[PDB]
Structure 1
Amino acid sequence: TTVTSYPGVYIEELNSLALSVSNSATAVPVFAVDEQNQYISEDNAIRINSWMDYLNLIGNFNNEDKLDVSVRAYFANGGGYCYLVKTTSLEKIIPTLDDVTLLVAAGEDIKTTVDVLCQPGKGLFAVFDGPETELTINGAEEAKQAYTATPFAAVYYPWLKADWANIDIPPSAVMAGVYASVDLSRGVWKAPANVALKGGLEPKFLVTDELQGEYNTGRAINMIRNFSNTGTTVWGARTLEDKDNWRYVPVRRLFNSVERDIKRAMSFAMFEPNNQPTWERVRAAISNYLYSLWQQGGLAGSKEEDAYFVQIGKGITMTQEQIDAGQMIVKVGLAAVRPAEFIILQFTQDVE
């Protein structure tokens, strides 16, 4: 690289791109990497703290690599540190790593691993790609058939393209950075839609509004489409579940984030005596956290007693039988905010 013999200064001339670092507490993605990738090994995650950290692992930035153009688009949008796990050993390493929240397919088939590791208990959310082909409003319900109906997944359709990238960029890798950029500036409870992409991105296929109405309904495919005043922007917040409970990705990612923070407060109660002075410390630790989250506007309620409730007790939640087994049962409820998705203007010709 550079060899330094005299103290001096050095006025080397080279074109290397440098991206500014960001720290994200809530979004740590795991990029699925294909086999025939000679840089990372099987069965260990390589933590990449920054774009410079990634640019030391590989020698040159490669335009032809699907992994290279996906990682550069991730760090240009504001992503923090991420892990790089190969896709065949992917189901063994994600349970080892504690603080992993996102699971990102950078143009990879992770549909086998997402069914077996995305459970209601585990905190993994899994954003992956739409189909690379330009689809139709006509054969539209067959494209939604290819994806599973899990509530933990979101599909973003158009593979983005850039002037620096030779190949088209998978859209899930830019959305791991948009998730980290939204939650840092406005919070996890805010939806990641109508946010502009900071990198030099634009969609490969311009999407009509009538086509987006087909895909938004049943197994919803969010779409990245260009607006003349905003540039390119994300235009969906819906998961793959059509049920009214987990329809939107800000509600699903809020519940994933809250239960991870409650996991850390219940870590200190581990292997403490199972009696009442522990339970009133478990309840007080959760009640502080949900109150300060409600004060940030994360939970929807005018009255503080409307936003959440916590219930521990020997009469209430756990039996005398279950206490002797070693169990401790808490009930938490939350009231998330839903995003306004449609705005209907009525224009009247007479003013009255």
Structure 2
Amino acid sequence: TQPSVTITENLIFPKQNDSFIGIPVFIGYTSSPVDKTAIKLHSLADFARSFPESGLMYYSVRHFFENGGQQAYVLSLGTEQQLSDFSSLITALQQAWLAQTIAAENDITLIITPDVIRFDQTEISDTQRDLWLQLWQSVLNLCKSRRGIMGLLDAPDDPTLAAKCLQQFSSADRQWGVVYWPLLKSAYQDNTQNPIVLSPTAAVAAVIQRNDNQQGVWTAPANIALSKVISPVRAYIEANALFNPDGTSLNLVRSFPGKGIRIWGCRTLENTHDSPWSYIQTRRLVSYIEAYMTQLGRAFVFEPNNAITWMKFKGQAHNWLRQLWLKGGLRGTQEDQAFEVLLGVDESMREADLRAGKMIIKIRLAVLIPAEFIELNLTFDTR
């Protein structure tokens, strides 16, 4: 027992101070019961500390961490013995304490439900279509608990049913929903040595979190290869009805010869042609801009409402926005084209607003458009 060098199988869990723009939360039934709080994980070791290494939730979290993820949250709805059917899961996602827990946590930015894959999908009845429509609305209602959160959604395995859901979905929360298809055959094996089928949303969340630090929040997270994925469940030739340039559409997950399995879409559920939130990276960039202005704006609460205060905000907001513009985060060849900030007693407010205690700031932005299609026209030089 003297001082010496020894080999151990124990693990250490030092505190981590890193921060990321996009942090997902895994909401579903776990191996063991826990309280109503959200557990923060820094690696797969933290998950084993709280839950046993088994079940669908374990492999979804493992798939997240092996795809480049760094920080995640787990919210347990109960033990795995309470799984009954699809409608019960929808009811569980509609509980009241979920919104309060999500809202109280400011780190959470994405929502993932790994337990949608468990249930059977052998009937293409209209009852199933209504059930899927309810699930999307339930997740989107959780995103509305706080500005900036979006939910990564699953789709019915049968392409005909999925196309039916897209056409008949109606909601005012489309801009906060992103759907991926189909399911993925992971590289992990269960007791009977069969591959484990996982939802693509677990790997997409790691890609989105990783892409923010590498390329930027204004860069589309599509066209990126996944890891620990053997093959998608269904081939790309079955998804010709799931992309509508003038309607609701899915983001396909596809394999290429020599390129692996890659994400092949960047659209949200926003079906309006002229809507500005048709792309995920556009919705995330504006929320990233909103988050900064919220933080900057908080410094001026309970401050005197005079011209000096407005200049302090306008100078700093103009300063930060130009730095983002010079990094390629906004579209425009001239500074006045990229953005504009208005804040004054007559530019954006009235004397009535000052008496009410308000301070109104007007911000305009110009965003970039992803390159989805490339057409080549070849002509002969007339010389």
Calculate the TM-score normalised by the size of structure 1.
0.86
Pairs within 5 Å for 1:94-133: 94-108=102-116, 111-119=136-144, 122-131=147-156, 133=157
Q: Distance in 1 between matches of 2:369 and 2:307?
A: 37
1:231 equivalenced with 2:260 (yes/no): yes
Q: Which amino acid in 2 is paired with 1:215?
A: F
Equivalent residue for 1:278?
Answer: 309
Which residue of the other structure, out of 148, 155, 177, is the alignment partner of 1:153?
177
Instruction: Name 2:166's counterpart in structure 1.
Output: 144
Out of 93, 96, 111, the position equivalent to 2:101 is 93
Which amino acid in structure 1 is aligned with residue 188 of structure 2? W
Instruction: Give the 3 Å change call, closer, same or farther, for CA 23–215 of structure 1 in structure 2.
Output: farther
Letter in 2 for 1:101: T
The AA in structure 2 aligned to 1:30 is: V
C-alpha contact 1:299 1:334 (8 A) present in aligned 2: yes
Amino acid at match of 2:365: L
Aligned residue type for 2:341: V
Q: Deviations over 1:214-264 (max 9, x none)?
A: 434422110111011210000000000022311111111111111011111
Match among 315, 318, 325 for residue 287 of structure 1: 318
| 1:55 equivalent among 36, 48, 58 | 48
Equivalent residue runs for 1:1-352 within 5 Å: 7-10=4-7, 23=18, 25-34=20-29, 37-42=31-36, 44-59=37-52, 61-62=53-54, 65-86=55-76, 87=93, 88=95, 89-108=97-116, 111-119=136-144, 122-131=147-156, 133-136=157-160, 141-145=163-167, 147=169, 149=171, 150-166=174-190, 167-208=196-237, 211-217=239-245, 218-243=247-272, 244=274, 245-346=276-377
Cα contact 1:22–1:78 (8 A) shared by 2? no
Cα distance, 1:85 vs structure 2: 1.9
Return the offset for 1:160.
Answer: 1.2
Q: Which is worse superposed, 50-59 or 257-266?
A: 50-59
Higher share in helix:
2
- How big is each residue's C-alpha offset from its partner over 1:294-319, in whole Å with a ceiling of 9 and x where there is no partner? 11100011111110000001012122
- What's the offset of the Cα at 1:38? 2.2
| Alignment check: 8 A CA contact 2:111 2:152 kept | yes
Q: Is the contact made by 1:91 and 1:113 (CA closer than 8 Å) also made in structure 2?
A: no
SS for the counterpart of 2:319 is helix
Q: String of CA shifts for 1:180-215, please: whole Å, max 9, x gaps.
A: 12111111111011001133453111121x724543
Contact 2:249–2:267, Cα closer than 8 Å, also in 1: yes
Which runs of structure 1 show a deviation greater than 4 angstroms over 4 or more consecutive aligned residues? 21-24, 145-149
CA distance in 2, matches of 1:184, 1:165: 32
Preserved CA contact (<8 Å) 1:193 1:236 = yes
Unpaired segments ≥5 residues, structure 2:
77-92, 117-133, 191-195
Letter of the 2:100 partner, please give it: K
The letter of the residue matching 2:98 is L
Structure 1 58/121 Cα, relative in aligned 2: closer, same or farther at 3 Å?
closer
- Provide the rounded CA distance (Å) in 2 between the counterparts of 1:278 and 1:308: 21
CA distance in 1: counterparts of 2:302 and 2:240, whole angstroms: 52
Percentage of matched positions with identical amino acids: 32
Does the Cα contact within 8 Å between 1:24 and 1:180 map onto a contact in 2? no
**1:100 counterpart letter in structure 2:** I
Task: Describe the superposition over 1:250-293 as per-residue Cα deviations: whole angstroms up to 9, x where unpaired.
Answer: 11111111101111111211211111111111112211111111
Change (3 A) 1:140 1:118: closer
Distance in 1 (alpha carbons) for counterparts of 2:361 and 2:145: 17
Question: Deviations along 1:151-191, whole A, 9 cap, x unmatched?
Answer: 11110011111121543111111111110121111111110
**Secondary structure, aligned partner of 1:333:** strand
* Distance change >3 Å, CA 288–CA 201, structure 1 → 2: farther
Which segments of 5 or more consecutive residues in structure 1 lack a partner in the other structure? none
* Residue type of the alignment partner of 2:287: N
CA–CA distance in structure 2, aligned partners of residues 322 and 201 of structure 1: 59
Q: Which one-letter code corresponds to 1:315 in the other structure?
A: D
| 8 Å contact from structure 2 (residues 99, 145) kept in 1 | no
Q: Amino acid of the residue matched to residue 203 of structure 1?
A: P
1:147 Cα shift?
4.8
Alpha carbons 2:342, 2:363 under 8 Å: kept: yes
What secondary structure does 1:70 align onto?
helix
Calculate the aligned-residue CA RMSD, in Å. 2.7
What secondary structure does 1:9 align onto? Answer: strand
Mark the CA change 1:318 to 1:351 in structure 2 (over 3 Å): closer, same or farther: closer
Distance in 2 (CA, whole Å) between partners of 1:206 and 1:29 is 28
Normalised TM-score (structure 2): 0.79
Q: Is the 8 A contact 1:148 1:240 kept in 2?
A: no
Partner amino acid, structure 1, of 2:279:
Y
Deviation, structure 1 residue 141 = 3.5
Change over 3 Å in CA distance of 1:192–1:346 after alignment to 2: same
Counterpart contact for 1:220–1:238, Cα < 8 Å: yes
Distance in 2 (CA, whole Å) between partners of 1:178 and 1:94 is 22
Q: Given that residues 79 and 178 in structure 1 are in contact (C-alpha distance below 8 angstroms), is that contact kept between their aligned partners in structure 2?
A: yes
